């Protein structure tokens, strides 16, 4: 099972994750339609996600990929926003968490921009926004993002008109 360990805001690890969140906010071409209008976040909590089984599943695949890619896992830390965040931290990522209509194929999507992942917290296109206010730019309701270890291996480079 998964356990969640709170990081102290006085801890360098907390501060490093917060800085990655804050420093990768950008403006979006929808003017804030999907994710809201903001330049920064109020970080309320950062938890480490610990699951021995899921870790071992991850490291087993990382080793396979690294060996296929001539001893290079090409591992990154990347953001993921999803309406399935609760399920992901308990069960791990699988095909239920893919973006079937994504422009780079039916797969699981991650971002370098925290604000790009923020657009998916309430669903594709921001859905109907937060449950309580139906507001994609809600400043009241708490949101959750994941900051994930991701094995890219040999990555196919696709330029996109975005």
């Amino acid at each position: 099972g998964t356990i969640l360990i709170d990081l102290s805001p006085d801890d360098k690890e907390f501060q490093s994750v917060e800085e990655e969140m804050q420093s990768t906010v950008r403006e979006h071409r929808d003017g804030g339609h999907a994710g809201g209008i903001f330049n920064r976040y109020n970080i309320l909590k950062i938890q480490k996600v610990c699951n021995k089984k899921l870790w071992e599943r991850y490291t087993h695949r990382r080793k396979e990929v690294s060996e296929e890619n001539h001893n290079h896992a090409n591992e990154r830390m990347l953001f993921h926003g999803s309406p399935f965040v609760n399920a992901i931290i308990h069960k791990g990522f699988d095909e239920r968490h893919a973006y079937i209509g994504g422009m780079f194929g039916a797969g699981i999507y991650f971002a370098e921009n925290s604000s790009k992942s923020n657009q998916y917290v309430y669903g594709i296109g921001g859905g109907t926004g937060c449950p309580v206010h139906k507001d994609r730019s809600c400043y009241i309701c708490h949101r959750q993002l994941l900051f994930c270890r991701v094995t890219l291996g040999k990555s196919f480079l696709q330029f996109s008109a975005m």
């Binding site: 994750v17 969140m21 950008r26 071409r29 994710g35 809201g36 209008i37 903001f38 330049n39 976040y41 109020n42 309320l44 909590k45 950062i46 938890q47 996600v49 899921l54 991850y58 695949r61 990382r62 990929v65 296929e68 890619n69 993921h80 965040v85 931290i89 791990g92 990522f93 095909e95 893919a98 422009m103 780079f104 039916a106 797969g107 699981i108 999507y109 991650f110 971002a111 790009k116 923020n118 400043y139 708490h142 949101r143 959750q144 993002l145 994941l146 994930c148 991701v150 094995t151 890219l152 291996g153 040999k154 990555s155 196919f156 480079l157 696709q158 330029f159 996109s160 008109a161 975005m162």
Partner: protein, 47 residues
């Protein structure tokens, strides 16, 4: 879920018009990601 491009393990989607937009990445096996941190937050209204 689709398959990776042959000989590849992921896709890097790189915005070519917006120069301030960072990359997006796609994996086709759930085992290639681990949800290391869970971040709880609010967006802030600009002043």
């Amino acid at each position: 879920m689709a398959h990776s491009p042959p000989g590849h393990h992921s896709v890097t989607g790189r915005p070519s018009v917006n120069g301030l937009a960072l990359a997006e990445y796609v994996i086709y096996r759930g085992e290639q990601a681990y949800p290391e941190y869970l971040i709880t937050y609010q967006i802030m209204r600009p002043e």
